[PDB]
CSV table of C-alpha atoms and ligand atoms in Angstrom, one decimal:
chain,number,residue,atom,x,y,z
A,1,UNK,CA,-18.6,-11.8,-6.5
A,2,UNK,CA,-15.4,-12.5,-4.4
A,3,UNK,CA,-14.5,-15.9,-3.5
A,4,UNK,CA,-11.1,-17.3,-1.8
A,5,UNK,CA,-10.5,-18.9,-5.6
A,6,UNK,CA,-11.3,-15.8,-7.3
A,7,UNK,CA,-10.9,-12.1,-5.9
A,8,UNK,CA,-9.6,-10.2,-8.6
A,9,UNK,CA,-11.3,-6.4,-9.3
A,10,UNK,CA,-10.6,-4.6,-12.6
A,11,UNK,CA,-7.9,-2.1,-13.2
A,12,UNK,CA,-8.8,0.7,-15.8
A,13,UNK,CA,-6.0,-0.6,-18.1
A,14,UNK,CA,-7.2,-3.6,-19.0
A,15,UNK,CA,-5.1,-5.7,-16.2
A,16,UNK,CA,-6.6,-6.8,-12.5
A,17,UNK,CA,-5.9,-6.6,-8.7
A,18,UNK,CA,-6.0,-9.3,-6.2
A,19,UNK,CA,-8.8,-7.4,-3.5
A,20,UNK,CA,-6.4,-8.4,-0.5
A,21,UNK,CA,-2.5,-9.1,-0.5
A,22,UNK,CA,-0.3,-9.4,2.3
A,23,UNK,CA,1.8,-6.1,3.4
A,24,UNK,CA,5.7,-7.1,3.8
A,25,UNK,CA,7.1,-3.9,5.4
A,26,UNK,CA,8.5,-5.3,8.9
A,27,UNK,CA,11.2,-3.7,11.4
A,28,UNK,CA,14.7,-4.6,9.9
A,29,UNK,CA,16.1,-4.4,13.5
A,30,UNK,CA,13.8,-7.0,15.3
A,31,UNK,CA,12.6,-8.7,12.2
A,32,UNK,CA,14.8,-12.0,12.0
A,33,UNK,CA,16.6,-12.8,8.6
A,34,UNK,CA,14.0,-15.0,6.4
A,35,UNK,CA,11.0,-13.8,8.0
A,36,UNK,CA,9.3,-12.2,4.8
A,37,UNK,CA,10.1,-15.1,2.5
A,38,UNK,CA,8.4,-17.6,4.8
A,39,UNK,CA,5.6,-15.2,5.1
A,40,UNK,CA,5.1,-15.0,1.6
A,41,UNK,CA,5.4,-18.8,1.3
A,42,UNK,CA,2.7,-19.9,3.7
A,43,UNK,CA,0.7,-16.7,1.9
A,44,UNK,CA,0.4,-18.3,-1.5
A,45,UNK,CA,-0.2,-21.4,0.1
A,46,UNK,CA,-3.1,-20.1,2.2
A,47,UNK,CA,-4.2,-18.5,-1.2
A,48,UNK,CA,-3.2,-14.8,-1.1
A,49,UNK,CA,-1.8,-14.0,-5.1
A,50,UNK,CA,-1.0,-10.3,-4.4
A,51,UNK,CA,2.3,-9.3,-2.3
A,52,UNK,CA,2.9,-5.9,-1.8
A,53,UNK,CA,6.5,-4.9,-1.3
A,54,UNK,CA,9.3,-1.7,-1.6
A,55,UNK,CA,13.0,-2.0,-2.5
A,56,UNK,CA,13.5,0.5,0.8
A,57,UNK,CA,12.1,-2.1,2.9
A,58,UNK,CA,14.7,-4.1,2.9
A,59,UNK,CA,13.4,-7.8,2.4
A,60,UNK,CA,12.4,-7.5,-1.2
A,61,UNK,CA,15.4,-10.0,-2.4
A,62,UNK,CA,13.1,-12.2,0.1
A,63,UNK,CA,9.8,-11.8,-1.4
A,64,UNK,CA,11.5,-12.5,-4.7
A,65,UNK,CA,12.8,-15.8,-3.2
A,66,UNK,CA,9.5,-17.0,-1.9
A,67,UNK,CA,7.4,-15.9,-5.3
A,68,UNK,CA,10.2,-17.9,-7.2
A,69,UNK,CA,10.1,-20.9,-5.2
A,70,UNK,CA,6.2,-20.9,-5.2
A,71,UNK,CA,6.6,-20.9,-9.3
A,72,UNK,CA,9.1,-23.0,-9.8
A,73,UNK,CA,7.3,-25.7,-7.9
A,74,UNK,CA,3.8,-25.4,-9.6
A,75,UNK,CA,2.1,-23.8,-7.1
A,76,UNK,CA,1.2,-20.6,-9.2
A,77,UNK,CA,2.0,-19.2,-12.3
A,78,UNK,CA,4.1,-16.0,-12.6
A,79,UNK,CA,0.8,-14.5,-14.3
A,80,UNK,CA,-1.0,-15.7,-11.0
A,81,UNK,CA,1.0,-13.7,-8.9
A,82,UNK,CA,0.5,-9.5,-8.3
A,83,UNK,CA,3.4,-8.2,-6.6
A,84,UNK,CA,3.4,-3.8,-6.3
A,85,UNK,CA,6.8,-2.6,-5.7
A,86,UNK,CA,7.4,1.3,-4.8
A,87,UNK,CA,9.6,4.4,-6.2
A,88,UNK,CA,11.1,6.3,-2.9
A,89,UNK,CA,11.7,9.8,-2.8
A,90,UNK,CA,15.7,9.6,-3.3
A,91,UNK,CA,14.6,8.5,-6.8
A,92,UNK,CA,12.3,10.9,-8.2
A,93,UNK,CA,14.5,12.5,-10.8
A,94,UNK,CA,13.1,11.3,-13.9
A,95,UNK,CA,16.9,9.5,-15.1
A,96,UNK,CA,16.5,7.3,-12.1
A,97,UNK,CA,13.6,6.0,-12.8
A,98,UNK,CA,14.0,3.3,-15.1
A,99,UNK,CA,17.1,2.3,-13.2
A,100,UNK,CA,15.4,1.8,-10.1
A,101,UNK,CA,12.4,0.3,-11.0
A,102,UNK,CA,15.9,-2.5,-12.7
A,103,UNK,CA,17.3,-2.6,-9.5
A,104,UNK,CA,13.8,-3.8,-8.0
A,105,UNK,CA,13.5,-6.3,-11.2
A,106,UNK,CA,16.5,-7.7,-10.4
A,107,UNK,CA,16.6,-7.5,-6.9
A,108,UNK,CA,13.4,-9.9,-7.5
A,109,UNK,CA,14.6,-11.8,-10.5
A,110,UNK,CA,12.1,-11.2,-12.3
A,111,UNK,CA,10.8,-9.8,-15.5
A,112,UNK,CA,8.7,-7.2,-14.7
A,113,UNK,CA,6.3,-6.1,-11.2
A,114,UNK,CA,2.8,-6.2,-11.4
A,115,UNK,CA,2.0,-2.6,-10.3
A,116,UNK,CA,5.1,0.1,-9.8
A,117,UNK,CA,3.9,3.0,-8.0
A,118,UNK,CA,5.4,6.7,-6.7
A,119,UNK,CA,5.2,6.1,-2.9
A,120,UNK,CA,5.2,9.5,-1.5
A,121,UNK,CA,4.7,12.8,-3.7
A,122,UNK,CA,7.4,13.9,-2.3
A,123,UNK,CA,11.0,14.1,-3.4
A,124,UNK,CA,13.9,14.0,-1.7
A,125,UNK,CA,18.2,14.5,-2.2
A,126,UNK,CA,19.2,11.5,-4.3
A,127,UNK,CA,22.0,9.3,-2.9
A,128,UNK,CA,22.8,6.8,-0.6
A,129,UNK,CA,20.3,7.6,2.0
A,130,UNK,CA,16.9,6.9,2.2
A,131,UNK,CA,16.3,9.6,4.9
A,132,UNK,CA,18.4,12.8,3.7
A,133,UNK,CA,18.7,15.7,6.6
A,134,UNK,CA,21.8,17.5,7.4
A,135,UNK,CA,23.9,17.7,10.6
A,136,UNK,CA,21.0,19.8,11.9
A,137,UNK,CA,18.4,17.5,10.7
A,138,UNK,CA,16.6,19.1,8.3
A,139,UNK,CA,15.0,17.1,6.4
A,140,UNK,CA,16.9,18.0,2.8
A,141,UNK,CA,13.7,18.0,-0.1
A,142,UNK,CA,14.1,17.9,-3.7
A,143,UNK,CA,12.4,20.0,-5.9
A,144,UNK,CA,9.2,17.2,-6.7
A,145,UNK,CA,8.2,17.7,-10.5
A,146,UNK,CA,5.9,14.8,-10.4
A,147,UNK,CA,4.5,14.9,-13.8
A,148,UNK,CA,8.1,14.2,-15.4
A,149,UNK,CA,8.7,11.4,-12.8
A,150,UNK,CA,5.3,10.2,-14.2
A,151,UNK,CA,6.7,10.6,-17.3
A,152,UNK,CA,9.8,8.1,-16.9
A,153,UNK,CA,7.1,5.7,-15.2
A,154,UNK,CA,5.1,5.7,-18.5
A,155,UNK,CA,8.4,5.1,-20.2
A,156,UNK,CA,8.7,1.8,-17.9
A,157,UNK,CA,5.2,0.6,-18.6
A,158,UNK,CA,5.9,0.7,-22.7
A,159,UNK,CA,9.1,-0.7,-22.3
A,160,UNK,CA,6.9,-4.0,-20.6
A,161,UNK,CA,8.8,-3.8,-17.3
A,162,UNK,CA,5.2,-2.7,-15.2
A,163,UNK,CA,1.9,-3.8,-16.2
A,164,UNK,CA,0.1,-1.3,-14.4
A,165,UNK,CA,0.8,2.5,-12.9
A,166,UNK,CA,0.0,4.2,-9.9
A,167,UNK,CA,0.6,6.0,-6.8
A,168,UNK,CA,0.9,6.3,-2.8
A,169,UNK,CA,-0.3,9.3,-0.9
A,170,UNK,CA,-1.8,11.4,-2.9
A,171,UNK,CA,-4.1,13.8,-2.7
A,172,UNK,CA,-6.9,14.8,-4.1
A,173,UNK,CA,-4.9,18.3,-6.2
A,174,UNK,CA,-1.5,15.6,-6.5
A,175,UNK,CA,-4.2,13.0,-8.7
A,176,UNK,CA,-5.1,16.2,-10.5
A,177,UNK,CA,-1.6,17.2,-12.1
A,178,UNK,CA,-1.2,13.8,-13.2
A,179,UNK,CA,-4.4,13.2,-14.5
A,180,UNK,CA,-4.4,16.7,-16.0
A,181,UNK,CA,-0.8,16.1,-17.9
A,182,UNK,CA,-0.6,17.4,-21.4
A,183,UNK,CA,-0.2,14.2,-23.4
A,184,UNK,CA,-0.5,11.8,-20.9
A,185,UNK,CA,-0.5,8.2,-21.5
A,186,UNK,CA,-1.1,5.9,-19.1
A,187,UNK,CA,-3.6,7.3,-16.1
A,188,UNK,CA,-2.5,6.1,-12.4
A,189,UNK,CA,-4.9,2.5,-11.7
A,190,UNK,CA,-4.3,3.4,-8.2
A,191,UNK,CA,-4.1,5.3,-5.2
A,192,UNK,CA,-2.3,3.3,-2.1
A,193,UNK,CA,-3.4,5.9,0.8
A,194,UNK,CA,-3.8,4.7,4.6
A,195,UNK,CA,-7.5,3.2,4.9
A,196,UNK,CA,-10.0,1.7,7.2
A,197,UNK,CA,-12.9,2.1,9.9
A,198,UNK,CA,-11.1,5.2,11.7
A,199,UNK,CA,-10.3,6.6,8.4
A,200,UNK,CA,-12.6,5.7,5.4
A,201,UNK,CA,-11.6,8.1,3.3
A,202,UNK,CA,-14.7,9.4,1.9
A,203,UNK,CA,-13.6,12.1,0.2
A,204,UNK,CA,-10.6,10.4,-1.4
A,205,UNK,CA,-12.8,7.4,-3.1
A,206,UNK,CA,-15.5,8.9,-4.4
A,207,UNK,CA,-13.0,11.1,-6.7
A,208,UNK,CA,-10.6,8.2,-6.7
A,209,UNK,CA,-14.4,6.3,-8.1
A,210,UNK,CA,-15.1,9.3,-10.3
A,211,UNK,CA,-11.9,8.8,-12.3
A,212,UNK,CA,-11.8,4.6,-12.1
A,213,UNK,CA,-8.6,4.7,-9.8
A,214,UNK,CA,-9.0,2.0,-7.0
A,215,UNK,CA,-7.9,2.7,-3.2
A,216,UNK,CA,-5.6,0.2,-2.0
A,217,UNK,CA,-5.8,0.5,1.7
A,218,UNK,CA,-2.4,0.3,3.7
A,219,UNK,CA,-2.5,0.0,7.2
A,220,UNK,CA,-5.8,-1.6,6.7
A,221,UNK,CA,-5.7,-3.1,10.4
A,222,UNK,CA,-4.6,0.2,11.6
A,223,UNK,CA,-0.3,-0.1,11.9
A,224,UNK,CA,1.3,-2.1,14.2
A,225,UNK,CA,1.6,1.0,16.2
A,226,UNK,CA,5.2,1.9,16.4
A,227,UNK,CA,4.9,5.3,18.0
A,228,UNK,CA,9.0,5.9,16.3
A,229,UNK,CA,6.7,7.1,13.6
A,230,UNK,CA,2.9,5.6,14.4
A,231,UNK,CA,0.5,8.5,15.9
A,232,UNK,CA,-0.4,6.6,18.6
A,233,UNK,CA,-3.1,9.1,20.1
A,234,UNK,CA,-6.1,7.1,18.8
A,235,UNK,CA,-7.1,4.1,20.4
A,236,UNK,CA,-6.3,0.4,19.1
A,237,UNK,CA,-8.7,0.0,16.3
A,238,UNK,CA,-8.7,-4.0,16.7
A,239,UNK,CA,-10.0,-3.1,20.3
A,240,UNK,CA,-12.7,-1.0,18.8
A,241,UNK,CA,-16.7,-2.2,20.6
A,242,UNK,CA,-18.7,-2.7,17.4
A,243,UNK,CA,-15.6,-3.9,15.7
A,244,UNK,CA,-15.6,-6.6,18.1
A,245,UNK,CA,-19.3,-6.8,19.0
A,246,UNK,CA,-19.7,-7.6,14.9
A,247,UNK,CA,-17.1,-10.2,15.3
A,248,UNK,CA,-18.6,-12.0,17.7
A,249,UNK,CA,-22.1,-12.1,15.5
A,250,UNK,CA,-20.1,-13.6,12.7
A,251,UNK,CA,-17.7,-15.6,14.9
A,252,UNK,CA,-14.9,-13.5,13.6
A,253,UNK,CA,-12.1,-11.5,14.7
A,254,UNK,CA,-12.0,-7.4,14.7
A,255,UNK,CA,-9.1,-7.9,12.1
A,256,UNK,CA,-11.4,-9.7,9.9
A,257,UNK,CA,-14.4,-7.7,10.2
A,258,UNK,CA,-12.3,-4.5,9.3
A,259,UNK,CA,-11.2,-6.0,6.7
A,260,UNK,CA,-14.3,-7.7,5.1
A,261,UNK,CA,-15.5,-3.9,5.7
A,262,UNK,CA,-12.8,-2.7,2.9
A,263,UNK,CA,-13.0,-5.3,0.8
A,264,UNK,CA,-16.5,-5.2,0.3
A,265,UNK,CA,-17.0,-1.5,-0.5
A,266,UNK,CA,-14.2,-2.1,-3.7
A,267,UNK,CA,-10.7,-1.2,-1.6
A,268,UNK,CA,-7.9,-3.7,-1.7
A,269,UNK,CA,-6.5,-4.5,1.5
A,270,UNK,CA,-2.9,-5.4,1.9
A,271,UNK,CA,-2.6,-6.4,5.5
A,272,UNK,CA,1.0,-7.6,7.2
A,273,UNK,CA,1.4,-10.5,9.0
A,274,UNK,CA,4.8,-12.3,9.4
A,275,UNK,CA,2.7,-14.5,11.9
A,276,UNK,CA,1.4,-18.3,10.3
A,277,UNK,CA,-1.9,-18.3,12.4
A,278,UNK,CA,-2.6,-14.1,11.5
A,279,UNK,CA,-1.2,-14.9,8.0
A,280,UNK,CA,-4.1,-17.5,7.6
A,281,UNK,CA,-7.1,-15.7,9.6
A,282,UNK,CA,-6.3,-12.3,7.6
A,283,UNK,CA,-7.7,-14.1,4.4
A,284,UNK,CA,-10.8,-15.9,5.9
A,285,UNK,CA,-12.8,-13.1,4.9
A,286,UNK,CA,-14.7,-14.6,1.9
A,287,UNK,CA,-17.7,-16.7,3.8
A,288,UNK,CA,-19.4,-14.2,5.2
A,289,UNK,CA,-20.6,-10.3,4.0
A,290,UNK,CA,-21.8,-7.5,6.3
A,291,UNK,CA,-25.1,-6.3,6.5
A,292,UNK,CA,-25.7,-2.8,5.0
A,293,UNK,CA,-26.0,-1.9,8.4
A,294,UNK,CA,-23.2,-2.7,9.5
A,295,UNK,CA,-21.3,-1.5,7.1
A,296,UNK,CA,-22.7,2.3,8.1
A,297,UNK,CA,-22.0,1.6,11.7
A,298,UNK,CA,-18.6,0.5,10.9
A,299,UNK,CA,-18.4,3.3,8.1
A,300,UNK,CA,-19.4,5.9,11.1
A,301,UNK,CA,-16.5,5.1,13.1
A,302,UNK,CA,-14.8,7.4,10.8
A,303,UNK,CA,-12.5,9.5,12.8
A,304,UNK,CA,-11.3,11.6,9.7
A,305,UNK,CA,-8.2,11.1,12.0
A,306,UNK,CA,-5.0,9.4,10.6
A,307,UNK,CA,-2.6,6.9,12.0
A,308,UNK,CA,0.1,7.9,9.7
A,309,UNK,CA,0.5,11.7,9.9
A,310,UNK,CA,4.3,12.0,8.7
A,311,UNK,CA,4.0,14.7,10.5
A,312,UNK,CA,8.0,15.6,10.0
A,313,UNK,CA,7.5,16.0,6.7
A,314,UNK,CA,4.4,18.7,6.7
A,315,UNK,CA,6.2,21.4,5.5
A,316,UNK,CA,7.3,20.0,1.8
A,317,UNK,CA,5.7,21.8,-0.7
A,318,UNK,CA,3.7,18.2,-1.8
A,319,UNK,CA,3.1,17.2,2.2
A,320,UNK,CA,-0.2,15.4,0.8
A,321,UNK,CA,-2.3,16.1,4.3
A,322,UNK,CA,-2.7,19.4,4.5
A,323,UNK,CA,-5.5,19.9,2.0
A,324,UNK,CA,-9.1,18.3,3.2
A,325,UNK,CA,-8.6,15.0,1.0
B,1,NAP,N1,2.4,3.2,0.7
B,1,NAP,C1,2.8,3.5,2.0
B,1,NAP,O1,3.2,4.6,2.3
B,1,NAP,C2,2.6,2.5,3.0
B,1,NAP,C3,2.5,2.8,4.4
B,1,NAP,C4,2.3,1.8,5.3
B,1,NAP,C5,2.2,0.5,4.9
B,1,NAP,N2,2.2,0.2,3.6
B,1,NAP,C6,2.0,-1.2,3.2
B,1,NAP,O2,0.8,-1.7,3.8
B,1,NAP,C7,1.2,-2.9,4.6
B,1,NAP,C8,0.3,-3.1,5.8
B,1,NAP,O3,0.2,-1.9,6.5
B,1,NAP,P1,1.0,-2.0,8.0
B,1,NAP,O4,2.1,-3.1,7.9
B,1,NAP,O5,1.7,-0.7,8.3
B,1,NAP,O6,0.0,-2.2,9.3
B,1,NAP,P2,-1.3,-3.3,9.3
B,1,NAP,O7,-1.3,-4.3,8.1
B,1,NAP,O8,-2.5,-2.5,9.3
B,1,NAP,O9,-1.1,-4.0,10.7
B,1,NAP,C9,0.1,-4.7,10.8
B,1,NAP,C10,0.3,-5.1,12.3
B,1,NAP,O10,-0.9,-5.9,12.7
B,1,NAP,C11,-0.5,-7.2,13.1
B,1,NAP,N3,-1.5,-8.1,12.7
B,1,NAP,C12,-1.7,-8.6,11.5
B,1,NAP,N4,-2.7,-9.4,11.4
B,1,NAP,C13,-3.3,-9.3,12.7
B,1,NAP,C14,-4.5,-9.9,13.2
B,1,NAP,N5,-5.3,-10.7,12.4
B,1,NAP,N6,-4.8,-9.7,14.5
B,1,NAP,C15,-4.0,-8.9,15.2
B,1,NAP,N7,-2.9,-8.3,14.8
B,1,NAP,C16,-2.5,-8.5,13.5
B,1,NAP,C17,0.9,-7.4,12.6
B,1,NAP,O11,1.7,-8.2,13.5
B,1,NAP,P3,2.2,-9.6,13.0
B,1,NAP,O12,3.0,-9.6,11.7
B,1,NAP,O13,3.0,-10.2,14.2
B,1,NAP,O14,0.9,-10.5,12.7
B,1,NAP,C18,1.5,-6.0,12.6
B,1,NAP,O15,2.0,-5.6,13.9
B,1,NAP,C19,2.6,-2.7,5.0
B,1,NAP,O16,3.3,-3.8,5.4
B,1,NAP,C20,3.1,-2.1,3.6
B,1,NAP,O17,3.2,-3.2,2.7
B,1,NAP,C21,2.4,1.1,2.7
B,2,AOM,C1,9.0,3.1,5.6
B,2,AOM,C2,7.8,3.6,6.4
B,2,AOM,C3,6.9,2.4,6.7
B,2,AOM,C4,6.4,1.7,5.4
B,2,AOM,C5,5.7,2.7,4.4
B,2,AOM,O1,5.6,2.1,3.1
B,2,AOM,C6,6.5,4.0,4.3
B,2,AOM,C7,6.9,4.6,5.7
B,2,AOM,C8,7.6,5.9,5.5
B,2,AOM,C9,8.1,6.5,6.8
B,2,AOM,C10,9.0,5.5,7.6
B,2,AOM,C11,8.3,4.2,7.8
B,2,AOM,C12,9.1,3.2,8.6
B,2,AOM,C13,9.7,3.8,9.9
B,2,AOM,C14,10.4,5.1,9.6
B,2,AOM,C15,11.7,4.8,8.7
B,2,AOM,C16,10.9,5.9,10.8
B,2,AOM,O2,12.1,5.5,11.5
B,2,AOM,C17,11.0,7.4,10.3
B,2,AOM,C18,10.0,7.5,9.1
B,2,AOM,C19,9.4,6.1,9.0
B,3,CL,CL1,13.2,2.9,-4.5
């Protein structure tokens, strides 16, 4: 039912999701000027219609550039194109919300984002920094009221500025408030939570399933490993033996098999590249399926073991990975 023309999966509000995009967070300090725009460019031409992006990141003026270009020359439609963007946890307090989620739009130039969702549950000081601590470096949280920052994002969705409405790293009890808010109107579509053979997150998707929320899967080829912030205690998982073992079956890379592996069980994968060649591999993932097999094999590598801990961050009252899932 997925093809390179057509990969779309439903949303429970009526819109759709492109099953893979390409991930655009990249180092601001060794990633040269231009990098993400070309990136985005050769995307859409290689036939990837779903960017996923974040004002904090730095390079968002940059995937607005290249979706612009790509319209403006025929090459898509702006209805063709899914692009996510992200609400950080400097801008939580529900007043903000509207005028971040403008900054983004016209940071973009554009009308409105595909999907806008609240990237970590938990809120920090508001201002000029995107990492608050004091001189002693304490990390300086904000009291998170998530249900009335849900609010102001359901305020943005009826204004037509979003199509869709969802979330990053939340758990289990976090989907729970929202889902659970008196008088809400517009349920989260989606869940963007760290996903793939080390970490399947069984748990997470079959309640994520229960309540039609899809899982997009970040690091879906496991981080680039920065250990600045990567747990780097677990093996590569592109060096992984069945991972590779399958690819050589299908003459395919690890990269591809992990991420046929997500795609197929119903996760989106948004996997960065910045690279041409990795750009183009990353999306060959349509002519071939794995065998039921081999998807518990590769299902079993489940560590239950994260890449992305946060662990700096464990003691905020909505850390989301304390509880099981
Ligand atoms: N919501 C959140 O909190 C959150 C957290 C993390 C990430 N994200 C999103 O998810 C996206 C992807 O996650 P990620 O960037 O952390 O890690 P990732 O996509 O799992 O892996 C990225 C790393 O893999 C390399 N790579 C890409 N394709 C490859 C291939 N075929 N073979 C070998 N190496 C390959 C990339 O280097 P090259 O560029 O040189 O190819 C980069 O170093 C992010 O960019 C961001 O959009 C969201
Ligand atoms: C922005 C990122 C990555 C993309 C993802 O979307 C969210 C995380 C949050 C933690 C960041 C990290 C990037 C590296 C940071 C800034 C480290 O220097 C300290 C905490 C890290
Ligand atoms: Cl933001």
């Amino acid at each position: 039912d997925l093809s390179a023309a057509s990969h779309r999966i439903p949303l429970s509000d009526g819109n759709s999701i492109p099953i893979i995009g390409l991930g655009t967070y990249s180092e601001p300090k060794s990633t040269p000027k231009g990098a993400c725009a070309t990136s985005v460019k050769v995307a859409i031409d290689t036939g990837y219609r779903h960017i996923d992006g974040a004002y904090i990141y730095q390079n968002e003026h940059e995937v607005g550039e290249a979706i612009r270009e790509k319209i403006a020359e025929g090459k898509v439609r702006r209805e063709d194109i899914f692009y996510c963007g992200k609400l950080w946890a400097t801008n939580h307090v529900p007043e903000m919300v509207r005028p971040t989620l403008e900054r983004t739009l016209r940071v973009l130039q554009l009308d409105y984002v595909d999907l806008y969702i609240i990237h970590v549950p938990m809120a920090f000081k508001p201002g000029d920094e995107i990492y608050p601590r004091d001189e002693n470096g304490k990390w300086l949280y904000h009291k998170s009221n998530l249900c009335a920052t849900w609010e102001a994002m359901e305020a943005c969705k009826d204004a037509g500025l979003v199509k869709s409405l969802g979330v990053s790293n939340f758990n289990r009890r976090q989907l729970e408030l929202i889902l659970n808010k008196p008088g809400l109107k517009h349920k989260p579509v989606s869940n963007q939570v760290e996903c793939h053979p080390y970490f399947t997150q069984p748990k997470l998707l079959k309640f994520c399933q229960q309540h039609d929320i899809v899982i997009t899967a970040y690091s879906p080829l496991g981080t680039s490993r920065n250990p600045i912030w990567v747990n780097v205690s677990s093996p590569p998982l592109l060096k992984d033996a069945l991972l590779n073992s399958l690819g050589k079956r299908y003459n395919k890379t690890a990269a591809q098999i992990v991420l046929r592996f997500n795609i197929q069980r119903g996760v989106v994968v948004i996997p960065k590249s910045f690279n041409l060649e990795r750009i183009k591999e990353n999306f060959q993932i349509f002519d071939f399926s794995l065998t039921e097999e081999e998807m518990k094999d590769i299902e079993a590598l489940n560590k239950n073991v994260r890449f992305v801990e946060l662990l700096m961050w464990r003691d905020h009252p909505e850390y989301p990975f304390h509880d099981e899932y």
